[PDB]
Design a protein around this nucleic acid. Sequence first.
DNA 1: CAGCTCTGTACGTGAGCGATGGACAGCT
DNA 2: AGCTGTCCATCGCTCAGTACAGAGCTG
Length: 199
Amino acid sequence: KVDRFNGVSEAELLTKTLPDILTFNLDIVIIGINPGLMAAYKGHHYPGPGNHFWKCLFMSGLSEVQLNHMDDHTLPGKYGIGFTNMVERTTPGSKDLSSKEFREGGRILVQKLQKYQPRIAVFNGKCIYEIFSKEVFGVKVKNLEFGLQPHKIPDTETLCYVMPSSSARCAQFPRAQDKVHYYIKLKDLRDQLKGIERN
DNA sequence: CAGCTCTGTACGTGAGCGATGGACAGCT
DNA sequence: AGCTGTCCATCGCTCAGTACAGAGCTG
């Protein structure tokens, strides 16, 4: 046996959830798939020592310094960034989640986005946008692409932006460096929106 | 046949944890 | 010089979505 959670069982973590960090007037809401074990353990967003989220946020220039999971509550006020997940239930990986859980998450998610109305809904993972698109827009494309989506959240001006998951489980974008392009394009989209709005 | 959905599988990089053993200091 | 134990550098093992082939299904 290997002690990964400082004496806390995996079974206890599987019962924990991760709070949303949402406010009104946000530029960005990072939508994770669900909490992984370390996120359920810490009660903070993307604490995975290998998770690329905080590294990509810094390397892209979305944060001026390298931040970590303990900084997640400062993001709404300082950077205009919030957090939620498509699915509430904690699991080791995306593969443990059922189609029903994802669709229930999708309905709750669109209601949250319609309430907070961030400038950009950022899907941190292709898999959750695949479900969201079919469920909310009734659209299923053969080749779903990353980046800006051609659909706004219904009854809002909220854009949908898709990125490969920040999880290092994903072999197709093996390093933080391979995902940073999407974070840079996110920053550019944010800056472009703030330019049009300011007169 | 030809699209589709569904499921099983393979995949690159970097980090914590636990085991290993060489360096070395304190003893006598 | 001989013994013994700690430190810690280092290594192996495990871990943290996505694309796609092929089966099964249906138009």
